[PDB]
Amino acid sequence: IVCHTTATSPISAVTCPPGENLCYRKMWCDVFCSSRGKVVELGCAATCPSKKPYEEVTCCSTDKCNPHPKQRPG
């Protein structure tokens, strides 16, 4: 699968390692949440990152299904 990644600047797409067939988007608040919104992390995954109390997680299985909130999927 191919996923968006926040490891690069600008955000780009990477082909995930074999066995990692999901894309993920993780978002959470830091000190700047009120003005900048939540922190955004995008990457690859074999297993969806566990759901943490004060964290939002989205995991999907189609190419580039995990875009930055400011971008459309695909």
Binding site: S9, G37, V39, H68, P69
Partner: peptide, 13 residues
Amino acid sequence: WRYYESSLLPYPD
């Protein structure tokens, strides 16, 4: 760098 939902441009740190 770190990204926030408010911009496609990354912030320092």
